[PDB]
PDB file of C-alpha atoms and ligand atoms in Angstrom:
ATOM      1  CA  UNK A   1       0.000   0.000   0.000  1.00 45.82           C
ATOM      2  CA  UNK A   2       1.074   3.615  -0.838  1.00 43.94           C
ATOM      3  CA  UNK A   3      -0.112   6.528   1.890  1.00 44.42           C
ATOM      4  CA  UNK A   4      -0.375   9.673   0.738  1.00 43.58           C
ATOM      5  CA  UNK A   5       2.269  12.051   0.408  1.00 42.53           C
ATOM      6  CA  UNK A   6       4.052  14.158   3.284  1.00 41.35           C
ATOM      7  CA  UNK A   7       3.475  17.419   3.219  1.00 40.08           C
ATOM      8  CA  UNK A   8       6.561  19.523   1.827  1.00 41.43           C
ATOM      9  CA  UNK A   9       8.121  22.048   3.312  1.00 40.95           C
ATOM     10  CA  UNK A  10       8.905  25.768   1.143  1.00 38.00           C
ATOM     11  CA  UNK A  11      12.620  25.501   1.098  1.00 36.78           C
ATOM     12  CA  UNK A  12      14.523  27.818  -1.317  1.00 35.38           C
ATOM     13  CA  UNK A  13      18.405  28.441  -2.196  1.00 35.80           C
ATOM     14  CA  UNK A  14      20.792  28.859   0.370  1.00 35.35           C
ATOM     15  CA  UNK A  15      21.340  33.017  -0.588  1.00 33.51           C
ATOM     16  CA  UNK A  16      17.583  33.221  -0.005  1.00 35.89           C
ATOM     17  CA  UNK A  17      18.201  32.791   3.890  1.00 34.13           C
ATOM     18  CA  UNK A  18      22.235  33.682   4.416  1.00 33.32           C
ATOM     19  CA  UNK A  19      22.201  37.007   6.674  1.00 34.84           C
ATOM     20  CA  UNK A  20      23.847  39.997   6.352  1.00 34.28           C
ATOM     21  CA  UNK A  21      24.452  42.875   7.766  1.00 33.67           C
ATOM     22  CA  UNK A  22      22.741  46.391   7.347  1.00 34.22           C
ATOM     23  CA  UNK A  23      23.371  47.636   4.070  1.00 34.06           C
ATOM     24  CA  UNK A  24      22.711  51.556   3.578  1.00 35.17           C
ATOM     25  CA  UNK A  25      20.818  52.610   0.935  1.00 36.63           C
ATOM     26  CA  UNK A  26      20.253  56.312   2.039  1.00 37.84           C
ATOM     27  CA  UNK A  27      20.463  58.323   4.840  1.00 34.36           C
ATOM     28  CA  UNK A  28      17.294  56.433   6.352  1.00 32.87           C
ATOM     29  CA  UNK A  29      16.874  53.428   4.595  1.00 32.42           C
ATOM     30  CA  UNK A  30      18.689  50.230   4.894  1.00 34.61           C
ATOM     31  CA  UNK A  31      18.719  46.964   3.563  1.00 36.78           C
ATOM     32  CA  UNK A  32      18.249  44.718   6.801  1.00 36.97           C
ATOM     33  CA  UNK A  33      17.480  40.997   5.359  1.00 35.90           C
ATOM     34  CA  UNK A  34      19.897  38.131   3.854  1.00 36.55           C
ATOM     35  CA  UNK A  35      21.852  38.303   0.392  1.00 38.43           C
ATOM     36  CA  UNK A  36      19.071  37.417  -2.105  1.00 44.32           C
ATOM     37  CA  UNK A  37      15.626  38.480   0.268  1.00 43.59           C
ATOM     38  CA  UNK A  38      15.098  42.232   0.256  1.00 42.48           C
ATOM     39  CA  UNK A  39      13.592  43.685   4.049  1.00 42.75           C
ATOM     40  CA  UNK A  40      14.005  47.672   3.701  1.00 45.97           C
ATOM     41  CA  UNK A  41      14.242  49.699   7.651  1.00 47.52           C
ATOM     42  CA  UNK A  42      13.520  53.110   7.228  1.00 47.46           C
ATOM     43  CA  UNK A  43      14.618  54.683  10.610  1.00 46.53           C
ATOM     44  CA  UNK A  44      13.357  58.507  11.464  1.00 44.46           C
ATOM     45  CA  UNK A  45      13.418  60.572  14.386  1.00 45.27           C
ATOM     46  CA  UNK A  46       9.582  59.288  14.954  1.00 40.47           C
ATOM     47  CA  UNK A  47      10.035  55.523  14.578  1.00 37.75           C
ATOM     48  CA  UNK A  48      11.017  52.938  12.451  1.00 35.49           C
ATOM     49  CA  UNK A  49       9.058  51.398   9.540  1.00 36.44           C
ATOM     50  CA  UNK A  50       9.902  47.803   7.672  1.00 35.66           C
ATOM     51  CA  UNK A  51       8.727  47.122   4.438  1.00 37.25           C
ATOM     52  CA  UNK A  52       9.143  43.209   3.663  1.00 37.22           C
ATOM     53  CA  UNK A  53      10.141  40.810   6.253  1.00 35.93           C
ATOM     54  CA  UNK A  54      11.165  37.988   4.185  1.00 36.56           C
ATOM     55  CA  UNK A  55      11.091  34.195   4.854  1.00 36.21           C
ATOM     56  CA  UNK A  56       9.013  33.083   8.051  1.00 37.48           C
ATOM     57  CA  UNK A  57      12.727  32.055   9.604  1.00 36.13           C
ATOM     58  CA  UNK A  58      13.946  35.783   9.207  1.00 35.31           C
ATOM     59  CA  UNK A  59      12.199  36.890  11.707  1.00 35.11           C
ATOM     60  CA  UNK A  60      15.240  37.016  14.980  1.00 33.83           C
ATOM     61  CA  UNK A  61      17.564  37.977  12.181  1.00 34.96           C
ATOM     62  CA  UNK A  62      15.429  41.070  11.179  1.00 35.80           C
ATOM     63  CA  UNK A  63      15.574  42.031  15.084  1.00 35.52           C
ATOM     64  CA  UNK A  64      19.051  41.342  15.726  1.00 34.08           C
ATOM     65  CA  UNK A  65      20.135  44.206  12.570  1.00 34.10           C
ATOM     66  CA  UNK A  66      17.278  46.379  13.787  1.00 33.19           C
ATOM     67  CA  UNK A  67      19.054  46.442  17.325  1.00 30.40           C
ATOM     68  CA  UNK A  68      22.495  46.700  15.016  1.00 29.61           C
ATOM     69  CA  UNK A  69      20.706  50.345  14.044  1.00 28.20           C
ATOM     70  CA  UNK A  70      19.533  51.557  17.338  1.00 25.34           C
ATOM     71  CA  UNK A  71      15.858  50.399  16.771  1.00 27.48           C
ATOM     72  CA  UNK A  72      14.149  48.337  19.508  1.00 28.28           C
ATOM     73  CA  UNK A  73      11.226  46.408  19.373  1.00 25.53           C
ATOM     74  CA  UNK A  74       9.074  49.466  20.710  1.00 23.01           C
ATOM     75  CA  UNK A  75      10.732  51.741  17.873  1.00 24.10           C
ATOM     76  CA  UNK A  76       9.518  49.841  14.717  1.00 23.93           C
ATOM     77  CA  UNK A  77       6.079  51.379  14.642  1.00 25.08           C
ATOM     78  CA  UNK A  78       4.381  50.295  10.802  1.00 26.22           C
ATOM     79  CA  UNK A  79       5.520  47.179   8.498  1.00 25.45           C
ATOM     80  CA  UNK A  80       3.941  47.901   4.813  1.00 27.93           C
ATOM     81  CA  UNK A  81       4.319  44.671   1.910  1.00 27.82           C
ATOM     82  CA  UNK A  82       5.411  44.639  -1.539  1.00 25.86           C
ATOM     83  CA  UNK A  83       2.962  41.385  -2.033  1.00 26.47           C
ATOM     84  CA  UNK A  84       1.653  38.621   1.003  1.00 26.24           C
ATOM     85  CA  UNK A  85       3.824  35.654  -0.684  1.00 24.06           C
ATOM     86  CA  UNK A  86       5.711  33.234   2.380  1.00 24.35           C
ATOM     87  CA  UNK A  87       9.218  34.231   0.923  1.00 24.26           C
ATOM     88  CA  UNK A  88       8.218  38.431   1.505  1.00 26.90           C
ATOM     89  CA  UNK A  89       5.670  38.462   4.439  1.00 26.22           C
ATOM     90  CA  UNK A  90       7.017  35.030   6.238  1.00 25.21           C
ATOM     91  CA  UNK A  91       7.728  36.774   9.598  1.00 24.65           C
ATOM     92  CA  UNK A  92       5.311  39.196   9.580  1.00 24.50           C
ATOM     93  CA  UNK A  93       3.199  37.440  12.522  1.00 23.67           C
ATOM     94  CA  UNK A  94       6.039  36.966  14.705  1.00 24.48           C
ATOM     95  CA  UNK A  95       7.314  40.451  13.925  1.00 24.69           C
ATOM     96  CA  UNK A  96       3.763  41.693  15.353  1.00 21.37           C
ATOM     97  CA  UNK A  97       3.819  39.694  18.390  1.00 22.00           C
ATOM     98  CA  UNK A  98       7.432  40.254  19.210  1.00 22.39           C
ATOM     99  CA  UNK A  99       7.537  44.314  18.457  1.00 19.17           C
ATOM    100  CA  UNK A 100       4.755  47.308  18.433  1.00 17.39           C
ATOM    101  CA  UNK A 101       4.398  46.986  14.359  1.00 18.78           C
ATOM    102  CA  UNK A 102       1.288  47.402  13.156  1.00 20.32           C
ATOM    103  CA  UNK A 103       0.494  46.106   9.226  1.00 18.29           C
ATOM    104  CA  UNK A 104      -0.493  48.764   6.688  1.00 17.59           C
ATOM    105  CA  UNK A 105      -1.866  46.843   3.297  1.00 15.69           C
ATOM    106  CA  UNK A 106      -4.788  47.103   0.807  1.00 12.15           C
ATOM    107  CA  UNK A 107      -7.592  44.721   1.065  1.00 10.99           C
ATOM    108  CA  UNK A 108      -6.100  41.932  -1.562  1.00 14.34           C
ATOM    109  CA  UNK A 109      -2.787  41.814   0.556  1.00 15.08           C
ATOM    110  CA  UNK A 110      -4.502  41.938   4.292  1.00 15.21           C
ATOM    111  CA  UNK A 111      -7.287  39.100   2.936  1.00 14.25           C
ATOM    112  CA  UNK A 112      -4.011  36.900   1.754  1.00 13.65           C
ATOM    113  CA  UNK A 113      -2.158  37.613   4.595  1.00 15.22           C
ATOM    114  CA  UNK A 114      -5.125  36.520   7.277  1.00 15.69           C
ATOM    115  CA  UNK A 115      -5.131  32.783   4.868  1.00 14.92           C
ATOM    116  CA  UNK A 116      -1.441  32.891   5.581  1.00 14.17           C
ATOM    117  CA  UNK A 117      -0.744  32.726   1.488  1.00 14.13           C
ATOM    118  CA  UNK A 118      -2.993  29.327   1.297  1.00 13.38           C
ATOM    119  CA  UNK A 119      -5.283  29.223  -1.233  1.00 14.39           C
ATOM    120  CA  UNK A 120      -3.402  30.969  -3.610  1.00 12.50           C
ATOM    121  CA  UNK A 121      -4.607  31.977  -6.627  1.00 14.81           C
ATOM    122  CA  UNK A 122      -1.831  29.877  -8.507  1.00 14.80           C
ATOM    123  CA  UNK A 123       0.021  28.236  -5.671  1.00 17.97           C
ATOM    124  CA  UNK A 124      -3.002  27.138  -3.992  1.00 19.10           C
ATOM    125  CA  UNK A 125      -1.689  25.976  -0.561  1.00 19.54           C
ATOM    126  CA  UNK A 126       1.825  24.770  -1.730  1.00 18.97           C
ATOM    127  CA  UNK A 127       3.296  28.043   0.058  1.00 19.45           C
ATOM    128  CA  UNK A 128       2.076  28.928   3.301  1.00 19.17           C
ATOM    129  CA  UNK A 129       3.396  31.011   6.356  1.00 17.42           C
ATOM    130  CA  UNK A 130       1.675  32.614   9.506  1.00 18.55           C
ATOM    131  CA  UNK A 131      -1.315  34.302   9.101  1.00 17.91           C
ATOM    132  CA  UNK A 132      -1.453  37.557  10.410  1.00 15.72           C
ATOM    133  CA  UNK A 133      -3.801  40.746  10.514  1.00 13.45           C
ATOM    134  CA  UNK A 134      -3.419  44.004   8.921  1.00 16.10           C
ATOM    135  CA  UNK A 135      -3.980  47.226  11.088  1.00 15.81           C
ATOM    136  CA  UNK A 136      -4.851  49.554   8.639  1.00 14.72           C
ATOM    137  CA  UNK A 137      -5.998  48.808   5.149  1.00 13.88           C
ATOM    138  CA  UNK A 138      -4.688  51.519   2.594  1.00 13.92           C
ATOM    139  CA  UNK A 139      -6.472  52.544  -1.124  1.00 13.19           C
ATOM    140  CA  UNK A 140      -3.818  53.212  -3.832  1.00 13.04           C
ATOM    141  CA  UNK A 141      -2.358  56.507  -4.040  1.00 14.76           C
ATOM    142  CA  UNK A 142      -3.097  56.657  -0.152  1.00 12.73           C
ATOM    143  CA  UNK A 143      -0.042  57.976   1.725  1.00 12.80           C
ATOM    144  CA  UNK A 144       1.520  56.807   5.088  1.00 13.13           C
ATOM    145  CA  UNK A 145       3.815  59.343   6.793  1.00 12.11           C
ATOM    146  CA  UNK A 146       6.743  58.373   9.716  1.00 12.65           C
ATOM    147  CA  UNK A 147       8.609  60.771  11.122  1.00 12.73           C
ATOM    148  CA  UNK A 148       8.426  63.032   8.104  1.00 12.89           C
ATOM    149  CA  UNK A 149       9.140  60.184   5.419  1.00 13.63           C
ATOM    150  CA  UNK A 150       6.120  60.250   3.066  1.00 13.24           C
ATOM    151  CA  UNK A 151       5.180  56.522   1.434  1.00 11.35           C
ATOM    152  CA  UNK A 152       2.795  56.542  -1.227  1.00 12.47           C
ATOM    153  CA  UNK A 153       1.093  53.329  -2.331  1.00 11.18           C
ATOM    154  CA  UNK A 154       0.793  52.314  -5.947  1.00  8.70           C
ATOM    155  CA  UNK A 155      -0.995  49.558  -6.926  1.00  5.17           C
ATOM    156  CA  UNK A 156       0.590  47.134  -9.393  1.00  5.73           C
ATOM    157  CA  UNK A 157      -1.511  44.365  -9.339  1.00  5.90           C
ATOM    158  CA  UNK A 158      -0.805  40.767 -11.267  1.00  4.86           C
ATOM    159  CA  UNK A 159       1.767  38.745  -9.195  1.00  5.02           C
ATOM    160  CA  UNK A 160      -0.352  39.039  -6.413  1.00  4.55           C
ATOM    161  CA  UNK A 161      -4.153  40.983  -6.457  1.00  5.09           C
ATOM    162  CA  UNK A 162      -2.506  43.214  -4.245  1.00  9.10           C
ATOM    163  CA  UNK A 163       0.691  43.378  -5.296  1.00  6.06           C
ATOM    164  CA  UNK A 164       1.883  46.897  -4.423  1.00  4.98           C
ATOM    165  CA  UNK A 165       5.003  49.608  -5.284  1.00  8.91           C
ATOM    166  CA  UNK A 166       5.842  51.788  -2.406  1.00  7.33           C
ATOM    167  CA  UNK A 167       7.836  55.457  -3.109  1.00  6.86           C
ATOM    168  CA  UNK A 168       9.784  57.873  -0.543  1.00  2.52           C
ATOM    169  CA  UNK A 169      11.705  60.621  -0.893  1.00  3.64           C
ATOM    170  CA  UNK A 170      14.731  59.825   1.256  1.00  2.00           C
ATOM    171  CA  UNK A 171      18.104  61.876   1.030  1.00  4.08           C
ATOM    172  CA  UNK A 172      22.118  61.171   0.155  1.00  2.00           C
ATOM    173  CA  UNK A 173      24.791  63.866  -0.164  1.00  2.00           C
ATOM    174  CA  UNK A 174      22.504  66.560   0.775  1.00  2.00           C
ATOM    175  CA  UNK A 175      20.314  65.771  -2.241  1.00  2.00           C
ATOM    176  CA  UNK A 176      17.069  63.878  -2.898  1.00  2.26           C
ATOM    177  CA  UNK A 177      16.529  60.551  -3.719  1.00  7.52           C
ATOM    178  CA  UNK A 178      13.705  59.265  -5.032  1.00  6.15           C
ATOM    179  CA  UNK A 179      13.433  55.377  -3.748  1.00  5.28           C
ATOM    180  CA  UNK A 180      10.837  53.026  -5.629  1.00  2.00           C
ATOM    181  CA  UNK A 181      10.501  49.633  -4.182  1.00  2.00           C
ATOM    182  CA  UNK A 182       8.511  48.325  -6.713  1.00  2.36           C
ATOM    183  CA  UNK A 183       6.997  44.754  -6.507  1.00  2.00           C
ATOM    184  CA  UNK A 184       7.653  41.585  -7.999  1.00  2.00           C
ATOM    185  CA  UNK A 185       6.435  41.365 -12.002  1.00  2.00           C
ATOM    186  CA  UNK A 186       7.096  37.534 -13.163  1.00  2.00           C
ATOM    187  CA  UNK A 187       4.159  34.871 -13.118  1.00  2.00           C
ATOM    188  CA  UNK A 188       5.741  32.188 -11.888  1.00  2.00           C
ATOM    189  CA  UNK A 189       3.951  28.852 -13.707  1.00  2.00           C
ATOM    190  CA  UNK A 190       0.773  31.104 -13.721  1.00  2.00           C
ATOM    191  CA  UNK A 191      -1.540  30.271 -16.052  1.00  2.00           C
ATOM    192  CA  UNK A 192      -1.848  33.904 -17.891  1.00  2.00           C
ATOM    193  CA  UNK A 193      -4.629  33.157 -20.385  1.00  2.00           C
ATOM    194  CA  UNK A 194      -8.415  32.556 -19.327  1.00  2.00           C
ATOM    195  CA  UNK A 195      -8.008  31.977 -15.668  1.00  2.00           C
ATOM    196  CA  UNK A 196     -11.024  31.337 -13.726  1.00  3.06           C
ATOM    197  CA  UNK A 197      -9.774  32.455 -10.869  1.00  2.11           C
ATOM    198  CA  UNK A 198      -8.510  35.663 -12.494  1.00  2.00           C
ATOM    199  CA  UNK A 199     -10.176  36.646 -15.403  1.00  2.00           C
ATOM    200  CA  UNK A 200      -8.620  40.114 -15.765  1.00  2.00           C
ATOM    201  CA  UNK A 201      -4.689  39.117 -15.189  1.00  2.00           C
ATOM    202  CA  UNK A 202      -3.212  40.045 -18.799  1.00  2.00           C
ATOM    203  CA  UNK A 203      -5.094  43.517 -18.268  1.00  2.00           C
ATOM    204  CA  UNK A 204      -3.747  44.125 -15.010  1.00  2.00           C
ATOM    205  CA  UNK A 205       0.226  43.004 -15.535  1.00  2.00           C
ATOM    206  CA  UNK A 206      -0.269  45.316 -18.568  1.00  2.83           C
ATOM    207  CA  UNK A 207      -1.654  48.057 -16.325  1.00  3.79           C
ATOM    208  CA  UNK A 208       1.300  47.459 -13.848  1.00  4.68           C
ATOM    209  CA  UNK A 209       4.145  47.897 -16.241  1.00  5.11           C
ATOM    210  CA  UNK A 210       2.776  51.080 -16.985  1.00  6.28           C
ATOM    211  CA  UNK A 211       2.598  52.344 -13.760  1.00  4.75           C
ATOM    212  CA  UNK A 212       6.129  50.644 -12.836  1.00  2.56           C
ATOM    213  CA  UNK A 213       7.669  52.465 -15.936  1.00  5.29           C
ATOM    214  CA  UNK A 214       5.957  55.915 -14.469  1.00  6.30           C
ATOM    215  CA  UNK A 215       7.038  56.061 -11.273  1.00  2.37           C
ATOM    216  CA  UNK A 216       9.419  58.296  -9.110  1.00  2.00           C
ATOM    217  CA  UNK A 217      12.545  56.706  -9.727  1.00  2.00           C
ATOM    218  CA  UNK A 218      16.098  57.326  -9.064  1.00  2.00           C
ATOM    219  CA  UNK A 219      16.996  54.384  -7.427  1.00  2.00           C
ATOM    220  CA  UNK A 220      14.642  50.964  -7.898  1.00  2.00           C
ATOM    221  CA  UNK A 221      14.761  48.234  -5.538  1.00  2.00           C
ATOM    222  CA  UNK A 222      12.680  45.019  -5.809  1.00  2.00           C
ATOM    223  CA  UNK A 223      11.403  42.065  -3.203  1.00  2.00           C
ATOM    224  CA  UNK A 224      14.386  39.514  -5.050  1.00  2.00           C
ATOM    225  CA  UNK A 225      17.029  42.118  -5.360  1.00  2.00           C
ATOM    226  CA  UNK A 226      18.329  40.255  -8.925  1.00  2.00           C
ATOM    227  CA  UNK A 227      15.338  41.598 -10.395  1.00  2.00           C
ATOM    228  CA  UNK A 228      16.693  45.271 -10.421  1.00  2.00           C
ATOM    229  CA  UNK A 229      20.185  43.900 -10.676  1.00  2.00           C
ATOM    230  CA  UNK A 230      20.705  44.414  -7.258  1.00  2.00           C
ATOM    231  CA  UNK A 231      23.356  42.661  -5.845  1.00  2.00           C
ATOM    232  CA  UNK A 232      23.639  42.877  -1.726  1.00  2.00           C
ATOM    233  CA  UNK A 233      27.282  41.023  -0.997  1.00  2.00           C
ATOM    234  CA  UNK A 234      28.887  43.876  -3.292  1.00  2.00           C
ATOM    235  CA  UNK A 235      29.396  46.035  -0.554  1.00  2.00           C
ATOM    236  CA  UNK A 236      30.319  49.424  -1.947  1.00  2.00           C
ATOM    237  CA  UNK A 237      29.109  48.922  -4.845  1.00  2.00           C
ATOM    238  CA  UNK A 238      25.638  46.890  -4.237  1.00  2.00           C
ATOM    239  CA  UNK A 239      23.413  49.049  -6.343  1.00  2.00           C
ATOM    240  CA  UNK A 240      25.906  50.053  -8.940  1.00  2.00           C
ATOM    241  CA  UNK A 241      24.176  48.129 -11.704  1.00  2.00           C
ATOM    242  CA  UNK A 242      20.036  48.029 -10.428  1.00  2.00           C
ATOM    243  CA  UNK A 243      17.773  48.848 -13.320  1.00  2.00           C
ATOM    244  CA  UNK A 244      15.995  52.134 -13.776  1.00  2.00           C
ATOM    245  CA  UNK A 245      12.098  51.372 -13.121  1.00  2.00           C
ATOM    246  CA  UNK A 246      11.569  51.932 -16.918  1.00  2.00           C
ATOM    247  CA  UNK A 247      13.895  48.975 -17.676  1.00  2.00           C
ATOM    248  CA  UNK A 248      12.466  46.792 -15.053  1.00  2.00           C
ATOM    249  CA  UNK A 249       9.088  47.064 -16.771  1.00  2.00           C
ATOM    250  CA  UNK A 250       9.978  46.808 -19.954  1.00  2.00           C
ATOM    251  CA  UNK A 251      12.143  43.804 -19.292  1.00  2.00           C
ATOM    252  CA  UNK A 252       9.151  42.426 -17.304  1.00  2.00           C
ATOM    253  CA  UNK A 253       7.380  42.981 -19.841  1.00  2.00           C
ATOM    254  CA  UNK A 254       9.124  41.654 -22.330  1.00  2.00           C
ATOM    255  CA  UNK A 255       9.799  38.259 -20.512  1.00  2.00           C
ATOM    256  CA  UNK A 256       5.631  38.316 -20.001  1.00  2.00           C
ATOM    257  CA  UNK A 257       4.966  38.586 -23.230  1.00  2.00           C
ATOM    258  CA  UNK A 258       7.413  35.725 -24.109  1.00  2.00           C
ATOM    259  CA  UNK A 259       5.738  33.655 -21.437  1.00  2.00           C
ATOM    260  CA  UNK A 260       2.350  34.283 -23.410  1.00  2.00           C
ATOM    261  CA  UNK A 261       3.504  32.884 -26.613  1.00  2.00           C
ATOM    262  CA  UNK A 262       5.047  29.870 -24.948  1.00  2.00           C
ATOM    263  CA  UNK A 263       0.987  29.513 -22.896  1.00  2.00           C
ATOM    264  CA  UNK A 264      -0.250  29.482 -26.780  1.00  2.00           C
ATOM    265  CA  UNK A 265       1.895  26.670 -27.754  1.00  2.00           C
ATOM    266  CA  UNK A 266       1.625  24.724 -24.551  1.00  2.00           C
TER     267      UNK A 266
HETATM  268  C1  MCO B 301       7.924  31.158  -4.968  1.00  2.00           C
HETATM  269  C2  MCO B 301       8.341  32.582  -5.374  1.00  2.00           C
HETATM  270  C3  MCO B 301       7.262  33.568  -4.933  1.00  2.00           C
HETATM  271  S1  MCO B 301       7.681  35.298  -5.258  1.00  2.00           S
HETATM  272  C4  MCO B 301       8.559  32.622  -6.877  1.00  2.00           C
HETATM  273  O1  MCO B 301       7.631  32.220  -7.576  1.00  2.00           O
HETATM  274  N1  MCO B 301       9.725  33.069  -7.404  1.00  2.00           N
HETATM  275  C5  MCO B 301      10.850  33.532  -6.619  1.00  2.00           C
HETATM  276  C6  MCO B 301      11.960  33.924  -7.578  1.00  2.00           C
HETATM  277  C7  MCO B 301      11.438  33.598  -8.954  1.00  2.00           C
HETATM  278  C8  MCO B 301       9.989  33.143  -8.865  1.00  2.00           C
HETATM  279  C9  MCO B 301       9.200  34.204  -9.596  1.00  2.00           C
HETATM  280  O2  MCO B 301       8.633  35.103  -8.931  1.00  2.00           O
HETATM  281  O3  MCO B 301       9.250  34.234 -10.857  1.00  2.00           O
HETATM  282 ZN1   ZN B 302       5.609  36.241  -4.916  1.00  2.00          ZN
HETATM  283 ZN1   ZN B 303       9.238  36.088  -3.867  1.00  2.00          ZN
END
């Protein structure tokens, strides 16, 4: 007799969960996560905000750099989401019981993250994590201010219903710099064309390169940092090659509409 099969675990290349230290990105923002898994700290004068935690393991790691900064527990005041996939908002529940974050997302995201990712659209419940509750639910354009840093929401639906770009205006050398951490724009084994569960999902990705390409954007940084040629062990020069948001979209794009044709003839 054969018994069904165990259940199997998300596990993902070693890079994916190999920490690092605080990387700075501008004079308040910081890449606090592993090599290959993007978790941005913004630290003001009024608190600290986190956008992306990660994997669901991250989650001590995440502290430990926070404390590296000066930010305690009580500090980190608001965690926003590029999308609720386990690999970006895996600690999130933790986070919220172990610190006084509070979860800012639109409904699509905050619906997701309560099922914990199961019941994916496309994944179904092959990649879950810890559910946990959003605080606040946001509307696109909406904007969230900390301690005088101003992040604006814009919706980018397609990987996720609710995937989401965020945009500040942070500062380096005296100057401004507009950061855009836009979300993740691949389709992973999706299937793109007539999907019951969502009907609209060529429209939408279509939609979202558009507003990707648009955006405020003088430096781009994405959920897998490769995306926008990001690449976090390079020290000094980390961010020397990212993409400009109008090359991440059209190479997003251009890979989408590839993975259309290939749909067609499968
Ligand atoms: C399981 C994850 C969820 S973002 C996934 O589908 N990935 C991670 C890196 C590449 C692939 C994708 O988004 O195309
Ligand atoms: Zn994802
Ligand atoms: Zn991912």
């Amino acid at each position: 007799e054969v018994p069904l099969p165990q259940l199997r675990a998300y596990t993902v290349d070693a890079s994916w969960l190999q920490p690092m230290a605080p990387l700075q990105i501008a004079d308040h923002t910081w890449q606090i996560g592993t090599e290959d898994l993007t978790a941005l700290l913004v630290q003001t004068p009024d608190g600290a905000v986190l956008l992306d935690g990660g994997m669901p393991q991250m989650a001590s790691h995440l502290l430990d750099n926070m404390k590296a900064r000066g930010v305690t527990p009580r500090d980190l005041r608001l965690i926003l989401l590029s999308h609720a996939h386990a690999d970006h908002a895996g600690p999130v529940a933790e986070l919220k019981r172990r610190t006084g974050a509070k979860v800012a997302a639109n409904a699509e995201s905050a619906v997701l993250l309560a099922r914990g990712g199961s019941d994916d659209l496309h994944f179904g419940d092959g990649i879950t994590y810890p559910p946990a509750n959003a605080d606040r639910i946001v509307m696109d354009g909406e904007v969230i201010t900390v301690g005088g840093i101003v992040f604006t929401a814009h919706f980018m639906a397609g990987h996720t219903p609710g995937s989401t770009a965020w945009t500040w205006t942070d500062t380096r050398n005296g100057k401004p710099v507009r950061i855009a951490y836009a979300d993740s724009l691949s389709a992973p084994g999706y299937q793109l064309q007539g999907n019951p569960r969502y009907p609209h999902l060529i429209e939408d990705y279509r939609r979202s390169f558009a507003t990707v390409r648009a955006l405020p954007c003088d430096v781009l940084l994405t959920p897998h940092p490769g995306a926008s040629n990001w690449d976090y062990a390079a020290g000094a020069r980390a961010g020397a090659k990212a993409l400009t948001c109008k090359a991440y979209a059209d190479a997003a794009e251009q890979k989408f509409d590839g993975q259309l044709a290939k749909e067609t003839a499968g």
